[PDB]
Ligand SMILES: NC(=O)c1ccc[n+]([C@@H]2O[C@H](COP(=O)([O-])OP(=O)([O-])OC[C@H]3O[C@@H](n4cnc5c(N)[nH+]cnc54)[C@H](O)[C@@H]3O)[C@@H](O)[C@H]2O)c1
Ligand SMILES: NC(=O)c1ccc[n+]([C@@H]2O[C@H](COP(=O)([O-])OP(=O)([O-])OC[C@H]3O[C@@H](n4cnc5c(N)[nH+]cnc54)[C@H](O)[C@@H]3O)[C@@H](O)[C@H]2O)c1
Ligand SMILES: OCc1c(F)c(F)c(F)c(F)c1F
Ligand SMILES: OCc1c(F)c(F)c(F)c(F)c1F
Ligand SMILES: [Zn+2]
């Protein structure tokens with residue numbers, strides 16, 4: 001048995017920014033009280049993982065990244081009550097402690113135990129379960145899914161359906177649930193409305209899916225890579241526009257196309273300029289814009305508050321506004337019942353050992369989601 | 375009889391920025407089709423009128439300002455159906471045409487016929503009804519209430535209760551309805567919540583009134599002028615804070631006071647810095663901040679969009695989000711039914727001839743609302 005013992009396994013360690021991951025042996029400590037050690041089965045490559053490499057997102061290095069994944073519980077620490085060895089689980093990069101003011105609020109999901117706002121790169125107890133070359137290695141968002149085995153706090157894992165296909169439902173751990181929730185829960189897109197989605201990667205595709213599910217009459221996809229347009233239309237976009245095709249700023253184009261501004265817009269890229277453009281393109285009196293993209297570290301946007309004074313609503317969200325631990329199992333159940341599709345997001349499959357090729361695919365513009373198999 | 379004739383009357387003309395109003399004779403043309411000429415009874419001095427004087431707001435000069443008022447219909451043009459000679463009325467600085475996409479939208483009030491966004495300083499037909507010393511004088515927001523008589527478009531006037539005391543209900547034309555609606559309708563303050571109101575003038579006080587009416591448990595007033603605090607507590611503030619008393623930024627103070635951020639905040643001043651502070655002080659996952667204040671023309675703020683990504687909502691509104699022509703008569707009816715009070719807002723009552731003295735009372739920090747009586 002491996003229970004109570006250190007596990008030696010392979011992980012993808014990031015030693016330095018702007019460098020390939022190093023696939024090499026790490027030591028994974030056994031779970032402490034209220035901790036869960038998970039044998040990973042599949043993990044997706046999300047742009048936020050790439051932000052760690054690029055320094056768009058600052059988190060302590062060296063690190064084991066990865067936050068969109070699914071696996072099987074190997075062992076549980078003392079006091080764990082919500083999962084058992086052998087359960088299928090999704091790590092929760094946004095925890096749900098159930099006890100803080102946000103967890104208790106009907107509309108909050110950004111649990112105060114998160115490691116996103118001011119990342120420490122640790123477990124909840126401020127220590128690391130990972131050693132590599134005798135050196136401690138940081139965690140990422142409490143999940144660190146780029147490893148054959150990880151350890152997570154109990155508040156950062158959800159039990160899911162035992163019959164779930166883990167190579168698909170890993171996307172519920174980030175990109176799908178984020179985009180879909182951003183539309184259905186955060187924006188509360190309405191029947192017959194006009195939507196604009198900026199960025200047609202896995203998360204923006206998922207936002208399109210949610211807009212369509214909510215009954216939007218028009219869904220305008222916006223991307224500078226026209227190769228993204230065919231799949232955006234397959235999942236519900238009614239039209240697609242490339243800002244590079246136009247002499248005028250795209251907020252003006254979108255305001256014209258929507259006869260005075262869109263009902264709902266979504267920034268699903270991570271640029272300061274598109275955040276302001278996306279706000280501006282929604283109708284000035286009653287439009288809603290949602291920021292989903294992750295901006296470059298420590299940078300401020302500039303905007304005219306008259307955009308808001310007229311009536312616009314501007315909001316953002318992590319993980320589609322979903323209370324993570326309550327929502328993930330339900331989302332998996334709904335997937336199993338064919339209430340939404342995940343295959344449109346999966347463009348490439350690779351073994352974990354080819355993680356760097358997976359990142360190359362994302363950076364080239366070729367992929368949506370590459371799913372890595374352990 | 376004056377109907378169908380030019381009226382020569384007294385008005386307060388603003389010939390140039392940063393100068394006193396000139397109280398002198400103007401000529402007021404009769405109303406054209408779908409226009410209403412009103413004998414003014416009382417008008418309030420709103421900070422937004424002062425913004426015209428100071429250059430904070432840009433609108434064509436020379437102008438007859440004034441937008442918070444009440445009077446009695448003198449005559450109607452052909453085709454008017456919603457008011458008759460002798461009716462008590464409130465001019466609507468945000469029109470309600472009833473036909474545009476905003477007017478048709480359940481949550482929109484910033485009617486596309488407004489003269490706020492891109493001011494022309496005319497009637498709807500692009501002409502002026504005012505002359506002074508042989509020169510055409512601009513209108514302001516379709517209202518121009520600093521005159522013994524004005525002419526407004528029908529879509530910019532509401533009939534109110536014939537028994538209304540005009541010297542009080544004129545506040546429903548701007549400051550009361552703006553503050554109150556910002557709380558009750560735009561923010562949708564909840565029972566038991568904690569609110570922070572930045573700026574304790576007439577509009578901020580009315581926002582306090584709304585927060586209290588909505589059942590807030592804590593209402594923190596914020597102002598640099600501690601002389602404003604006693605009246606803020608009278609109308610519902612549970613605590614008041616002066617940023618100048620603290621070594622730390624007031625967003626930090628308010629976050630500490632509210633054990634991690636407020637539920638609802640309101641910027642009711644008109645400064646870029648306080649708009650950002652107000653957003654920051656609301657709880658990062660589920661807080662809502664509403665911009666009410668009018669900032670200096672053409673200036674952008676800077677902010678970190680992580681404030682929004684965590685879950686905050688940022689919005690603004692004109693006129694408390696109220697559909698103007700539907701709402702004004704109901705607000706007056708509610709006042710007559712003792713559902714809210716207006717007297718706490720009124721600190722001074724002066725003849726119209728003392729308009730400049732009224733503006734000096736506002737600028738010196740000594741008044742809340744001065745009501746000018748014709
Ligand atoms: N809020 C959350 O909880 C959350 C979750 C998941 C992802 N993210 C972020 O969301 C963003 C999208 O993630 P993803 O879908 O995995 O990334 P992605 O697959 O890189 O998709 C982004 C898309 O944006 C397009 N794009 C780039 N620049 C522009 C431009 N100027 N105008 C229009 N399109 C442009 C680009 O071509 C690509 O198709 C990233 O910033 C992520 O970090 C946030
Ligand atoms: N959105 C709308 O429809 C609408 C309607 C009415 C008024 N307004 C605007 O709302 C604002 C308030 O109007 P008002 O109540 O008539 O003005 P006011 O009576 O001048 O009140 C403003 C208050 O802000 C206080 N103040 C000034 N600087 C600061 C600071 N740095 N920190 C905290 N407090 C400060 C000041 O002492 C005063 O009590 C103005 O900008 C108006 O133009 C907007
Ligand atoms: O993709 C999800 C995701 C985010 F939305 C973040 F804001 C973040 F900081 C991060 F590390 C992350 F992985
Ligand atoms: O006080 C109400 C009011 C506003 F909210 C404005 F945005 C504005 F431009 C204006 F002239 C005005 F009077
Ligand atoms: Zn929590």
Ligand SMILES: [Zn+2]
Nearest residue numbers: 046048174175
């Ligand atoms: Zn992600």
Ligand SMILES: [Zn+2]
Nearest residue numbers: 471474477485
């Ligand atoms: Zn209208």
Ligand SMILES: [Zn+2]
Nearest residue numbers: 420422548549
């Ligand atoms: Zn006003």
